[PDB]
């Protein structure tokens, strides 16, 4: 039946931009991985040395490439990593490999 995309978003980058904010950018999964229409993404992040689950934010697909998300309100002097997955109507696909960045002032 209907199922989620079968590949991860691509070219994920994470840039510290100061004020405890990270700038996350990424591109869609390979077109042949979409298994339908991409409706949006979930961006997950956590502290690199935490055994907690990733914390996620849902973002709608924009008409722009790459996609961009600012993650602000982070803690001082900690290091984070970020993952992204795409979703279609059915569900969310696999996640990108984490990309790491420090929350810088």
Author numbering: 387 to 491
Quote from the publication:
Chelicerata sDscams could be classified into two subfamilies, sDscamα and sDscamβ, containing one and two variable Ig domains, respectively. Crystal structures and cell aggregation assays demonstrated that both α and β subfamilies of sDscam used Ig1 for the isoform-specific trans recognition in a hand-in-hand manner. Furthermore, the cis interactions were established by the three FNIII domains of sDscam, which assemble into a cross fold with a kink between FNIII2 and FNIII3.
The gel-filtration analysis supported our observations in the crystal structures: Ig1 mediated the formation of trans homodimer and all the three FNIII domains were involved in the cis interactions.
